[PDB]
Amino acid sequence: QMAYRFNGIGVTQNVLYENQKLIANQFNSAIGKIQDSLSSTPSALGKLQ
């Protein structure tokens, strides 16, 4: 499915298959940083408040 989505933006699919581990690591790190991005900053949710 991720290879399909790579085709969707104009990149051939062999790129994903040859860089699968790197891509998964990058995704995991970004998800890990979202937690702190919300938690540390207290003014993130002003719209709801």
Add this chain to the structure above:
Amino acid sequence: SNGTHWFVTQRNFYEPQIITTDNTFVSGNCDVVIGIVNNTVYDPLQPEL
């Protein structure tokens, strides 16, 4: 795969066809990709010659 043979089809409709050189492209060795399989890729030119 039909269980015994391999084909290639479009994604939104089932229409199996023989895997040839005219509907595939080549990139690199078959050791980087995770999950690669062996099969025959037919070349239309050779039977004529």
